[PDB]
Design a protein around this ligand. Sequence first.
Ligand SMILES: [Mg+2]
Ligand SMILES: [Mg+2]
Ligand SMILES: [Mg+2]
Ligand SMILES: [Mg+2]
Ligand SMILES: [Mg+2]
Ligand SMILES: [Mg+2]
Ligand SMILES: [Mg+2]
Ligand SMILES: [Mg+2]
Ligand SMILES: [Mg+2]
Ligand SMILES: [Mg+2]
Ligand SMILES: [Mg+2]
Ligand SMILES: [Mg+2]
Ligand SMILES: [Mg+2]
Ligand SMILES: [Mg+2]
Ligand SMILES: [Mg+2]
Ligand SMILES: [Mg+2]
Ligand SMILES: [Mg+2]
Ligand SMILES: [Mg+2]
Ligand SMILES: [Mg+2]
Ligand SMILES: [Mg+2]
Ligand SMILES: [Mg+2]
Ligand SMILES: [Mg+2]
Ligand SMILES: [Mg+2]
Ligand SMILES: [Mg+2]
Ligand SMILES: [Mg+2]
Ligand SMILES: [Mg+2]
Ligand SMILES: [Mg+2]
Ligand SMILES: [Mg+2]
Ligand SMILES: [Mg+2]
Ligand SMILES: [Mg+2]
Ligand SMILES: [Mg+2]
Ligand SMILES: [Mg+2]
Ligand SMILES: [Mg+2]
Ligand SMILES: [Mg+2]
Ligand SMILES: [Mg+2]
Ligand SMILES: [Mg+2]
Ligand SMILES: [Mg+2]
Ligand SMILES: [Mg+2]
Ligand SMILES: [Mg+2]
Ligand SMILES: [Mg+2]
Ligand SMILES: [Mg+2]
Ligand SMILES: [Mg+2]
Ligand SMILES: [Zn+2]
Ligand SMILES: [Zn+2]
Lengths: 149, 69, 91, 114, 50
Amino acid sequence: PGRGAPLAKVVFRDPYRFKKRTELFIAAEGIHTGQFVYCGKKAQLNIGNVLPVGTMPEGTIVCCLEEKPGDRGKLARASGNYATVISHNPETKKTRVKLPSGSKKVISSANRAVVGVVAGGGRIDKPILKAGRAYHKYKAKRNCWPRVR
Amino acid sequence: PRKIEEIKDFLLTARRKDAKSVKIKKNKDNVKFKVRCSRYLYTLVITDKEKAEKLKQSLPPGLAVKELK
Amino acid sequence: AKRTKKVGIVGKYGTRYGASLRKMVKKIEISQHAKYTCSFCGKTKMKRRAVGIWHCGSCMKTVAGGAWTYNTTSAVTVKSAIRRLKELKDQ
Amino acid sequence: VQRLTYRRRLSYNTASNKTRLSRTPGNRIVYLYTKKVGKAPKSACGVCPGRLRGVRAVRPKVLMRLSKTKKHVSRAYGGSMCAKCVRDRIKRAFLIEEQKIVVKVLKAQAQSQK
Amino acid sequence: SSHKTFRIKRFLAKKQKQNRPIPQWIRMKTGNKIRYNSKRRHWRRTKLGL
RNA sequence: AAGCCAGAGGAAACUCUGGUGGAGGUCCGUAGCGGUCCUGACGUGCAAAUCGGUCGUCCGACCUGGGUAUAGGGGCGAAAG
RNA sequence: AGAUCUUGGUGGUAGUAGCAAAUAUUCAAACGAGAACUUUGAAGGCCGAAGUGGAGAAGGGUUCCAUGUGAACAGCAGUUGAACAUGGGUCAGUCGGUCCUGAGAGAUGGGCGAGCGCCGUUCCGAAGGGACGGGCGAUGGCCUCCGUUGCCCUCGGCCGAUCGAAAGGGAGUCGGGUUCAGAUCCCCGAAUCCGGAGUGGCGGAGAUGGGCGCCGCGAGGCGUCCAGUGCGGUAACGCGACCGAUCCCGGAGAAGCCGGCGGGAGCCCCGGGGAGAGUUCUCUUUUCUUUGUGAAGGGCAGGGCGCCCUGGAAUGGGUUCGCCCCGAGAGAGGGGCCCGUGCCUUGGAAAGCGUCGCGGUUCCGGCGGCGUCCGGUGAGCUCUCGCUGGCCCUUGAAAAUCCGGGGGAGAGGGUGUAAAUCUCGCGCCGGGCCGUACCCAUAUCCGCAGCAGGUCUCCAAGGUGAACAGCCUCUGGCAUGUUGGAACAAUGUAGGUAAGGGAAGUCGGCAAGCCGGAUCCGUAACUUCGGGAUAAGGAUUGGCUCUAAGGGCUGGGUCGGUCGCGGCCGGCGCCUAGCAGCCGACUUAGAACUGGUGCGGACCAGGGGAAUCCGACUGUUUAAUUAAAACAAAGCAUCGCGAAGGCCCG
Ligand SMILES: [Mg+2]
Ligand SMILES: [Mg+2]
Ligand SMILES: [Mg+2]
Ligand SMILES: [Mg+2]
Ligand SMILES: [Mg+2]
Ligand SMILES: [Mg+2]
Ligand SMILES: [Mg+2]
Ligand SMILES: [Mg+2]
Ligand SMILES: [Mg+2]
Ligand SMILES: [Mg+2]
Ligand SMILES: [Mg+2]
Ligand SMILES: [Mg+2]
Ligand SMILES: [Mg+2]
Ligand SMILES: [Mg+2]
Ligand SMILES: [Mg+2]
Ligand SMILES: [Mg+2]
Ligand SMILES: [Mg+2]
Ligand SMILES: [Mg+2]
Ligand SMILES: [Mg+2]
Ligand SMILES: [Mg+2]
Ligand SMILES: [Mg+2]
Ligand SMILES: [Mg+2]
Ligand SMILES: [Mg+2]
Ligand SMILES: [Mg+2]
Ligand SMILES: [Mg+2]
Ligand SMILES: [Mg+2]
Ligand SMILES: [Mg+2]
Ligand SMILES: [Mg+2]
Ligand SMILES: [Mg+2]
Ligand SMILES: [Mg+2]
Ligand SMILES: [Mg+2]
Ligand SMILES: [Mg+2]
Ligand SMILES: [Mg+2]
Ligand SMILES: [Mg+2]
Ligand SMILES: [Mg+2]
Ligand SMILES: [Mg+2]
Ligand SMILES: [Mg+2]
Ligand SMILES: [Mg+2]
Ligand SMILES: [Mg+2]
Ligand SMILES: [Mg+2]
Ligand SMILES: [Mg+2]
Ligand SMILES: [Mg+2]
Ligand SMILES: [Zn+2]
Ligand SMILES: [Zn+2]
């Protein structure tokens, strides 16, 4: 509720103790239930896989990008959005990417991201058509909607 | 309440240690023997009358034999 | 018998909201409420559950797709591009 | 006709205040306060939407006083997973272990040359 | 209400017990200067503190 | 309203007719909520804002209990200070 | 003597205004000094199941009940009272609180702060005080052997105290009787939940079989050896139990709104059989009332299944009101599971109820007779269960709590009337604390009051009718809303009618009036093609007697060739354009006759059209003079910001 992107509940194995770890990835479009997704440096380029940007080619586009090397995903999270890996330099370990706003950002090559575009499609294409639909939209988000000039 | 099917079960149910009493009710079609145990009232329904009387005399002693009529 | 000349599915909105807005929302509503062919089980039961979530009745497979259509042209081109970049990355 | 009243002080038609009509031996209609409708377990596979068979559908705290047989089915994962997905898991485990044997044999015969 | 706490019930109990007339023999005491209970409370005229 | 069935016409594209279906900040209209007009009643009142008839809406930005949060140059305001 | 002076008292007004919202009272009697108002009876009315009825939440706090009083109060009165006085009344393991978390509130660590303190709630903490497991031991002691205790090893993230719901989550109590006032709480009777049992309460299960030698006529006994943490079904799954820890996985708790169907109950309705009443001027085999079976078990219907087996489907088929379903296994046949609130049964008739009697214990859960029966209906209404859909840029709690599975660390006995163990049957003990009366509103609450205002819910009969509308009525309730009597002037307030004219009235058709339901026709400009539209306009409408149409259940044999006036196979025959009988709702269409042309006869119940301005619409707004053209809105456009950030609090 409150966001237009679907969330993917993914279950991993804990590498150190006998337990199942459940994550709440942001669903890149095209992934389905019962699909295996791979996270790490040696993961392959497939929709839904998570792997560092420095290991990705010069034109790939990514879904849930890290702003800093080690936090979780921070960029291109809203539905239908993606970032693009423009360039690398192995020295200084930097990767230049293009954000949904059109800006260019230099980040560490160790930042992870999900391959593909985030699901939720062209949600802004449909006209709301109704003050009631707008009311129900913002009731799930916050008290901001009826805006007095 | 529990309905006892055959006479053999009713005998040892009446001979149980917690059996408070037995009531005998004569209806138009049957005779009901009602033994009051700790948890349940056990009722045995006898269609004829000679078997009912045979049970009436074969009831164990030391137990109240209340007649409901 | 044919009941409406042109409004079709947006006849529920009456005279309201403007003809161009109703025409704009008509195709989106049609694709939103359409039933697509499931690419896993082959049946025509893949329909939208919520925005971006498409669930198949038969095989109970759930897919992250577009808001109003099962997949977006953007996502299709992205998948093709990622496949090409993968096959170029390896040899 | 005879109109009815609640028998408890909860005067609202909430989810815990559901009643049914009963005719007493005194020839009068009264409310009897019913228990909520229980549910059978769902399958631990998380895929097929039907609920399990052979397990009595009661409220969760009623299961404490049910016997063991009433709460499971005589089968592996019985009372926790459906038979169809148990068969699928048996086949999947066997075939994937066979595949592991196949790939081990394949690399063993492949490494026979320098 | 019918649902009440023990403290509230005790408070109402004390109010009931002290809402009563004076004894008749009080007015015969030496130097009484008391004619009637001037702290009498009626449930409809004046309401309690709680 | 979409969806669906049948009949008919078409080379096709498709069209026409009769049903079915039951959408909608849809219409009339109770309860509820509101308060247009009579500039009615009352105006030392039943009432420090009420009453009668007439009215607006009545599946939704709907009505409402209780529990919580926001406190004075502060709050809260689909906005009238 | 003044200050609209302060406090207190008192006049005229003035026996005046007034005691006029919600139809309504009358007769007789009783008590009593006293009766328009009290009580009883009779009559006439009202609320009319969306109540003026029956019960709760909040709030009140004794107003509840009985008795007595007649000072004051109940704006008349009172013999009455929610007044006054004196007594009395609220009984729980299973009804709630209590427990859980929700939005949130809030300590500690830390940080800040002159300071009282406040920030923060996982963040800058050495934040686990627990554990069946193993060892060291103290033998504490019935020192067999199991219970104690201290230390060590091993395991152990609720990662955060605590509070937060008498409508959310939350195990398990029902039937009858009983009081002046209490009852799901007392009594009687039927159950049930949780916890406990160390010395183990009883059974049952585990679990008590095969092999070899011998003895023994056989059966059966002896010794040895070996098994034995259950069994059945192809399956779904079943059987009464059915060893098992840390740990892991899952389920239940645990989910919106709306639509359409179907099952079940309660109520309603219809036809009979009783029992008691009512009518009887005439008729009426008549009209009215009444005509039970709790929880919890067992059995069986019925409903549901996205459960199984056989088999393999196009000339596609199955199927719904709609849908929808099928080589990823349709149709068909045979099964399995779940729910079972319905029926039968134990409860259970002994109780209850209705009638007819008989005894008395001033006031008997008295005693007795009889009965408590058979059927039919349905787009009926209300609950409930289920199935299947639709809507969402809306996806509709959490946690206590309980359970299943995976794994197999371990434990158990040497073949014994055996062991560990047991979610099986029965048995034994306990369940503390607090609330519980009554009102719940035109008189027990708030509004200064017995104030036409305000205040959250549950149940819901008959007729008419589309209807929870309005109008009439039954069950239940009441006395007309803080007085009565007599009159019937003006002026009023509320309601009607009015010849001829028809807005000439007025700022202005303000107010009133017209229209109105249903059926059959017929409907324009304009339009965003959806609408306008009930456009506009016209016809019909009663009563009575008929006539058609729209359904459901059964059974269709050609027969003794024979004996289980009847049954198995078969020589033995052609409803196959379907008949025969029975039962049953409403609804529609048509016709005749008919009345002083009257018929949606009350009730219910749009006046219409042509344009201009503004706002798109729906929505909101100055509680108490402005509901609008104002605000909002979708749509459009612009701006800031990539987090060391934009905007904002502090
Ligand atoms: Mg605006
Ligand atoms: Mg019953
Ligand atoms: Mg008051
Ligand atoms: Mg509407
Ligand atoms: Mg309307
Ligand atoms: Mg006025
Ligand atoms: Mg101004
Ligand atoms: Mg003076
Ligand atoms: Mg002077
Ligand atoms: Mg006067
Ligand atoms: Mg007057
Ligand atoms: Mg009436
Ligand atoms: Mg009431
Ligand atoms: Mg009283
Ligand atoms: Mg008086
Ligand atoms: Mg008093
Ligand atoms: Mg910890
Ligand atoms: Mg608490
Ligand atoms: Mg509750
Ligand atoms: Mg009472
Ligand atoms: Mg019965
Ligand atoms: Mg089949
Ligand atoms: Mg009897
Ligand atoms: Mg009470
Ligand atoms: Mg009032
Ligand atoms: Mg006050
Ligand atoms: Mg009054
Ligand atoms: Mg009157
Ligand atoms: Mg009067
Ligand atoms: Mg005239
Ligand atoms: Mg005239
Ligand atoms: Mg004029
Ligand atoms: Mg003039
Ligand atoms: Mg007018
Ligand atoms: Mg018009
Ligand atoms: Mg006629
Ligand atoms: Mg407007
Ligand atoms: Mg406009
Ligand atoms: Mg308003
Ligand atoms: Mg105003
Ligand atoms: Mg106004
Ligand atoms: Mg515009
Ligand atoms: Zn599929
Ligand atoms: Zn499954």
